[PDB]
Amino acid sequence: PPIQRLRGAVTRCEDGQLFISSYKNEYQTMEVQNNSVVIKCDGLYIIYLKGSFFQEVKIDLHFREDHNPISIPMLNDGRRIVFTVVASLAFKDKVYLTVNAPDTLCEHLQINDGELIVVQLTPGYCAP
Amino acid sequence: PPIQRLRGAVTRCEDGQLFISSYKNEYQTMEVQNNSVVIKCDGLYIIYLKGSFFQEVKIDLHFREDHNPISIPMLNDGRRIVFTVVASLAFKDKVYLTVNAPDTLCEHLQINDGELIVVQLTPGYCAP
Amino acid sequence: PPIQRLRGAVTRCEDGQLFISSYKNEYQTMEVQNNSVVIKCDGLYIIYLKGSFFQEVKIDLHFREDHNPISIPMLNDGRRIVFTVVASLAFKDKVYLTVNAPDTLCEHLQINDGELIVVQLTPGYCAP
Ligand SMILES: *[C@@H]1O[C@H](CO)[C@@H](O)[C@H](O)[C@H]1NC(C)=O
Ligand SMILES: *[C@@H]1O[C@H](CO)[C@@H](O)[C@H](O)[C@H]1NC(C)=O
Ligand SMILES: *[C@@H]1O[C@H](CO)[C@@H](O)[C@H](O)[C@H]1NC(C)=O
Questions:
Q1: How far is the CA of C17 from the centre of ligand 3 (A)?
Q2: Are C86 and B119 inside 8 Å of each other by CB?
Q3: Number of alpha helices (DSSP H) and beta strands (DSSP E) in chain A
Q4: Is A41 helix (H, G, I), strand (E, B) or coil?
Q5: Is C67 in Cβ contact with B119 (below 8 Å)?
Q6: Residue extents of the structural domains in chain B
Q7: Separation in Å, CA of C127 to nearest CA in chain B
Q8: C1-128, which class in CATH?
Q9: A41: which residues sit within 8 A by CB, 6+ positions away?
Q10: Is B111 within 8 Å of B11 (Cβ atoms)?
Q11: Are residues C2 and C28 in contact, defined by beta-carbon separation less than 8 angstroms?
Q12: Smallest Cα–Cα separation from C110: which of C18, C8, C3?
């Protein structure tokens, strides 16, 4: 298989989860299912989140069920996120984003130019 | 073509633009033209900027004409930048850095150990 | 040789140095020797450090003897580090971490879920 990557639009929040869309001008080699990026091949990956968020937000990055989610810091202006993680992912991992906030804040949250990039740095076993 | 990369020295500011030099101990596979890194091959790239800047600075990273430049945050000391972006670049994109400041501040700006690294993570079409 | 990578546990501090262990669920292609990651192949590498540190800490990242170490910033909570560097490494470079603090603070320092990831992005000469 090819180097695994996905660049998704992070479009909105509903019921405490950020929606992720594959609608970007990018050649995608991973699937999005139920607003999660589906890992098929093992490897070290970069996970990168960018966006202009119009509420001060507490977003959690979930990447593997056996580790705690990473709380994503905002930049000092309290309006932008530009955050990079490197992580060891495996087949069946789901990369997704949740919001720890009252649901009213979630449903109203505006995200400008939000994107999530997941990109494989090292090769590994791929599921059939 | 080889994996596309450039590690450039970010040397000074003139007329609101940071100068970028290919004078580093690095095997360069991209060109610098008029203080911009010239993209020849499509791909996801990391763009990384580091430096010790002796004025508190508002630097904008320009990477593609159809998206807004990214305002680069300083570290909390107000003296250093160590910043990582992942972006989707294409043939004809120019990666460059501008300074939003009075020109006197620009002309006097000292940058210690400034460097810009642009490195391809995924393969793509390369221009002839 | 394969793409060079190591994901190590950053376990504790002793005598001003953070200990690095290869005991992680990762296929390692670099060695740890005396709590340093031993570089065998030239390349641009990402160096990534994450951890929850229960003292506000001043950690220095050493990666090559001809450049100054990078002082690692904490996130704004004063409790976590999630930090990414891109650097040009060569055969004989040693990547290691030191703590600038009274030794009592070092010996007592608790690090939860500490890890250092060093991963090659571009190929280069490898030592025999
Ligand atoms: C989508 O995700 C949420 C997880 O909270 C769940 O409620 C819902 O049933 C999922 N739908 C499926 C299984 O596709
Ligand atoms: C270099 O860049 C600046 C862009 O502002 C421009 O003024 C100048 O004409 C350029 N020179 C060329 C075309 O190489
Ligand atoms: C381990 O590292 C420290 C460096 O400060 C040194 O004191 C010690 O002798 C080293 N041991 C060796 C050579 O493996």
A1: 10
A2: yes
A3: 1, 10
A4: strand
A5: no
A6: 1-128
A7: 17
A8: mainly beta
A9: A1, A4, A91, A120, A123, A124, A125, A126, A127
A10: yes
A11: no
A12: C18
